[PDB]
Write a protein that binds this ligand. Structure first.
Ligand SMILES: CC1=C(/C=C/C(C)=C/C=C/C(C)=C/C=O)C(C)(C)CCC1
Ligand code: NA
Ligand code: NA
Ligand code: NA
Length: 137
């Protein structure tokens, strides 16, 4: 597959519930959920090397990783973590995350290119799964 491109959101589910289980107060959540409903995503992939930029009106993240190599990033709520991405299947990556400090919900994410040309991002905290679906811009 090639994830490379600019991606636009077409569906979001369960992002408020995800932030809820992470313990974000309703007021800050409200700012976040609205902004996260319109994220713009740029991916540059060369083989196992990835750059992913996710931009919203309230927060932008930029990560560089290589599939199979540990790296440091932040959880969806900004907590520093170490992460490892692997290919779960041909067009699907899964990232497992461990907090650098302290105790917290177990978090992960997955990104998959689907047969129809879309991209599915999932983000999980404990049991709660957020799904966001994108199409190329
Ligand atoms: C403003 C703000 C937040 C916003 C988070 C957002 C907007 C996350 C968007 C995530 C997306 C689009 C992920 C795609 O991979 C936090 C950190 C929850 C709480 C602190 C204040
Ligand atoms: Na990430
Ligand atoms: Na994020
Ligand atoms: Na999944």
């Amino acid at each position: 597959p090639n994830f490379s491109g600019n991606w636009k959101i077409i569906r979001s589910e369960n992002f408020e519930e995800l932030l809820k289980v992470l313990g974000v107060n309703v007021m800050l959540r409200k700012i976040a959920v609205a902004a996260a409903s319109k994220p713009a995503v740029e991916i540059k992939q060369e083989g196992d090397t990835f750059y992913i930029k996710t931009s919203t009106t309230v927060r932008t993240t930029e990560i560089n990783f290589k599939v199979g190599e540990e790296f440091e990033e932040q959880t969806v709520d900004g907590r520093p973590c170490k992460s490892l991405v692997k290919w779960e299947s041909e067009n699907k990556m899964v990232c497992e995350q461990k907090l650098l400090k302290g105790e917290g919900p177990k978090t992960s994410w997955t990104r998959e290119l689907t047969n129809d040309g879309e991209l599915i991002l999932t983000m999980t905290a404990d049991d709660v799964v957020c799904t966001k679906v994108f199409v190329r811009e």
